[PDB]
Ligand binder design. Structure first.
Ligand SMILES: [K+]
Ligand SMILES: [K+]
Ligand SMILES: [K+]
Ligand SMILES: [Mg+2]
Ligand SMILES: [Mg+2]
Ligand SMILES: [Mg+2]
Ligand SMILES: [Mg+2]
Ligand SMILES: [Mg+2]
Ligand SMILES: [Mg+2]
Ligand SMILES: [Mg+2]
Ligand SMILES: [Mg+2]
Ligand SMILES: [Mg+2]
Ligand SMILES: [Mg+2]
Ligand SMILES: [Mg+2]
Ligand SMILES: [Mg+2]
Ligand SMILES: [Mg+2]
Ligand SMILES: [Mg+2]
Ligand SMILES: [Mg+2]
Ligand SMILES: [Mg+2]
Lengths: 191, 117, 208, 86, 137
RNA sequence: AAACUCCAGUUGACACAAAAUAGACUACGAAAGUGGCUUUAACAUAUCUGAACACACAAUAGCUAAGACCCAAACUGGGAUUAGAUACCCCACUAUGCUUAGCCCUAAACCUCAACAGUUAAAUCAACAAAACUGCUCGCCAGAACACUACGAGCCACAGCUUAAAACUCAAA
């Protein structure tokens, strides 16, 4: 996390693009001169933008820093930003028992409702001879319990030297969800 | 004075509940423990921070920090010789209390006798 | 070693032997009468009693030697000392009477001072605390300081950045830069000081 | 809260020697048991766990004080061997 | 007269002075040394705030606030603002056994303040609230 | 990281919560339990033994009803970790811990050592543990597992407690 607080007296860069407490642009100056300004006016230094090639810092009072920090949290409370998608992994065996496959199927369903990406890998069972067409059937068994909830983000694909398959499931988008409801309703009208 | 042991342990004849539950028998061994190796404090750390303070204000130019660099150097040499003498004196002389090895030889001659002869 | 532990290293110093007996102390008198009963190793073919012997230049020469080719390493060394001296004589004749007083023309004085300007005061040593290694700033011994100065200078001259420039011209140029507190070898010392100053918080992990 | 201030746990500095004053204060808080008390109170020690700790600390005191008494009693015997060779 | 480590009692006639001020008139430096932070406030004998500084207000963040060098930096910052208001001698009141307990006092001295006494006021309940449960590590 | 930002520090006012140090003491009580202060009442029995059920008690958790609420905290929610993490780590908060009135009747309720009387000599004694025994009495035990189970019965207990088997199985435990 990047907090909006006083940077302190030790500045990271040597050349600093400084601004005034009222927003007036003071141009670039050496950090030694900035510390002198902070002491002469009794102000604190905050970092407004870092993407710019010349580091942009601004002088502010303790009251301004509070007002900005309050403004930012209200912007998020009102317009909360979405977080990055978390990737969950599962490694199954070809000869996985049905009771255990049901346990992991219920777990995959809970990850999809939370809008996660589920990477499912299927390896050849121990002391078992299996074909890639039979291992690929487990994916459809898993995804069949989630008719209009999940779909393939990355279809089954041999990996690890052809020993194991791998796919990535995701939650259906809102447009894809309304389409499923539409197609389902059409079948209801036909039947 | 050593705290009393009368009526402290669960025994026949002792009515009260036990006061102490030693996981080892309260019988003196014929040896003491080995002194643990200690971690000393850093020396000249004060002079090190004074040196690195002038560097920050003089753009790491040694020409402007000679007196601070020299002080940190002299301290390091003095702390080096003292470290060289601390071994010859404290490790070999056994100042003050005896060392475990010597103290264990003294206990060998007067072993605790928890049995009858 | 083919020398038994009884063999002592030879002392190659004419002054040490011509010193009168009256000036000797009771401790120095004991050492001299003791060496008369000890076995002495043969003097290596490197050092002699010459008045032009310089142990620092001899050490820098060995650190430049590749595959035991001492003749070539020694050749590069004397060519550098000549190149430094010719550059200073050219700078001296082209200077004014006032500036001439500050121009050094002794290549041995320049070489020693250039290395002294590149020696780092502090370094980073890994100390184990709580099962993890931390780069802790610590004071460097005199041996390590001098070694790092030589190694950095030689490494900089072998860098591929120099295109077709011969070693005596590269090294002579780097020495005169370091002699004036400039160049990439001085920068490498400043980086080690900046990286040791950044880890100032970890300085207390040291116990000596 | 209701007591006077700058009386309890207060040590005066002598000749600007703040390090020695701090060590004196730390030694006072240690001998009175306040330091170990503060540390044990950071997390709740359940009663059965406290009783076990007290029993362990009391058995250790008894053992350490008896070993120390035997060392001081035998220390005079650490002199040179009077019958060397026999 | 021999040195007394006990502070002068108010109301009694003591001869100790610091710049002409009595012990009861010296400003106070309150140091709160927590496990993850250090806060320093200098107040006058009448409880007038003169300067405040903590590891957080000096640009340290997360685990770096709970260090001795961070507390020393906060001590220097508080001493600088207090020295401008005419503070020279201070009475140190420290509470908590955090890593910035002694370092915060060094920073105050490096900043130009003279410590005449040290007082511990670490809260110790005499029986109080139940603390949180032990950790499984 | 999340969380808070009517947040934090000093100062003052301020508990239906909990009781540093003393305690290196070893006391009180039938046991369970009992360690801030004061006062009132108050700790059975002039032989011993004597109960799953009689009679009276019995930590913590829990139930019912009405209150209090600092702090802690099952559950739950959020953060993180992980192949997964229904955990361990961080945050928040509830039942609950407190008071009152009734229940419930359990514990590694173990100092795993029954009460009373007596002994230190003989053979001292498998091992370990906390030396070995005598008299007397009550309680209890008889391969392992099934089994703190089934059934019956009793109980303010209704997913409970107490009492408590057998068949099948093994040659060990
Ligand atoms: K109390
Ligand atoms: K029981
Ligand atoms: K027990
Ligand atoms: Mg045990
Ligand atoms: Mg106690
Ligand atoms: Mg009876
Ligand atoms: Mg019966
Ligand atoms: Mg019963
Ligand atoms: Mg009960
Ligand atoms: Mg209750
Ligand atoms: Mg709470
Ligand atoms: Mg509650
Ligand atoms: Mg209460
Ligand atoms: Mg009990
Ligand atoms: Mg009985
Ligand atoms: Mg049986
Ligand atoms: Mg049960
Ligand atoms: Mg039952
Ligand atoms: Mg039944």
């Amino acid at each position: 996390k990047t907090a909006f607080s006083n940077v302190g007296r030790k500045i990271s860069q040597r050349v600093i693009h400084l601004f005034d407490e009222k927003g007036n642009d003071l141009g670039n100056m050496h950090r030694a001169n900035v510390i002198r300004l902070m002491d002469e006016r009794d102000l604190r230094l905050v970092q407004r933008n870092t993407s710019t090639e010349p580091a942009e810092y601004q002088l502010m009072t303790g009251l301004q820093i509070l007002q900005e920090r309050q403004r930012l949290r209200e912007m998020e409370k009102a317009n909360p930003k979405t977080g990055p998608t978390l990737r969950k992994e599962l490694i199954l065996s070809s000869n996985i028992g049905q009771h255990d496959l049901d346990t992991k199927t219920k777990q995959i369903q809970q990850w999809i409702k939370k809008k996660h990406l589920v990477q499912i890998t299927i390896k050849k069972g121990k002391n078992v001879d299996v074909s890639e067409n039979e291992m690929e059937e487990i994916f459809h068994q898993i995804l069949q319990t989630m008719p209009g909830i999940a779909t393939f983000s990355s279809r089954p694909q041999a990996v690890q030297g052809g020993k194991a398959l791998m796919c990535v499931l995701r939650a259906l988008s809102k447009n894809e969800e309304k389409a499923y409801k539409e197609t389902q309703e059409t079948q209801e009208r036909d039947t | 004075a050593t705290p009393s042991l009368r009526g402290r342990l669960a025994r026949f004849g002792n009515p009260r509940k036990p006061v102490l539950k030693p996981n080892k028998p309260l019988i003196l061994a014929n040896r003491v423990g080995e002194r643990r190796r200690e971690k000393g404090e850093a020396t000249c750390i004060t002079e090190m921070s004074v040196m690195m303070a002038c560097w920050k204000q003089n753009e790491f130019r040694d020409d402007a920090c000679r007196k601070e660099i020299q002080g940190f150097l002299d301290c390091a040499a003095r702390a080096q010789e003292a470290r060289k003498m601390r071994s010859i004196q404290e490790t070999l002389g056994e100042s003050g209390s005896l060392l475990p090895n010597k103290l264990n030889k003294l206990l060998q001659r007067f072993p605790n006798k928890p049995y009858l002869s | 070693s083919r020398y038994s532990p009884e063999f002592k290293d030879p002392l190659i110093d004419k002054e040490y032997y011509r010193k009168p007996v009256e000036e000797l102390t009771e401790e120095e008198k004991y050492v001299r009468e003791l060496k008369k009963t000890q076995l002495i190793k043969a003097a290596p073919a490197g050092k002699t009693s010459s008045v032009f012997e310089d142990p620092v230049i001899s050490k820098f020469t060995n650190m430049m030697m590749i595959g035991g080719n001492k003749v070539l390493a020694r050749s590069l060394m004397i060519q550098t000392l000549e190149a430094v001296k010719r550059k200073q004589f050219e700078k001296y004749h082209a200077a004014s009477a006032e500036e001439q007083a500050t121009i050094e023309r002794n290549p041995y004085t320049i070489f020693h001072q250039a290395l002294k300007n590149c020696e780092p005061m502090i370094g980073l040593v890994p100390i184990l605390k709580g099962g993890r290694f931390y780069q802790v700033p610590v004071p460097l011994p005199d041996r390590r300081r001098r070694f790092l100065a030589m190694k950095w200078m030689i490494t900089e001259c072998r860098d591929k950045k120099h295109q077709r420039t011969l070693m005596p011209e590269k090294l002579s140029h780097k020495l005169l830069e370091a002699f004036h507190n400039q160049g990439p070898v001085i920068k490498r010392k400043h980086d080690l000081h900046k990286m040791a100053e950044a880890n100032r918080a970890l300085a207390h992990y040291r116990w000596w | 809260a209701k007591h006077l201030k700058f009386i309890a746990r207060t040590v005066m500095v002598q000749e600007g020697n703040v390090e020695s004053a701090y060590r004196t204060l730390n030694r006072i808080l240690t001998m009175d048991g306040l330091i170990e008390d503060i540390k044990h109170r950071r997390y709740y020690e359940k009663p059965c766990r406290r009783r076990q700790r007290e029993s362990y600390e009391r058995c250790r005191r008894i053992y350490n004080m008896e070993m120390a008494r035997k060392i001081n009693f035998l220390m005079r015997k650490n002199r040179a061997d009077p019958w060397q060779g026999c | 007269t021999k040195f007394s480590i006990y502070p002068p009692i108010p109301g009694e006639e003591s001869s100790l002075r610091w710049a002409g001020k009595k012990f009861e008139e010296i400003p106070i430096a309150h140091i709160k040394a927590s496990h993850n932070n250090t806060q320093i406030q200098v107040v006058s004998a009448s409880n007038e705030p003169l300067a405040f500084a903590s590891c957080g207000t000096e640009g340290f963040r997360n685990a770096k606030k709970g260090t001795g060098i961070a507390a020393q930096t906060a001590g220097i910052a508080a001493a600088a603002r207090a020295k401008q208001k005419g503070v020279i001698h201070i009475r140190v009141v420290v509470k908590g056994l955090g890593p910035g307990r002694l370092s915060a006092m060094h920073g105050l001295i490096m900043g130009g303040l003279e410590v005449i006494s040290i007082t511990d006021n670490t809260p110790i309940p005499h029986x109080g609230c139940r603390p949180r449960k032990a950790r499984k590590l």
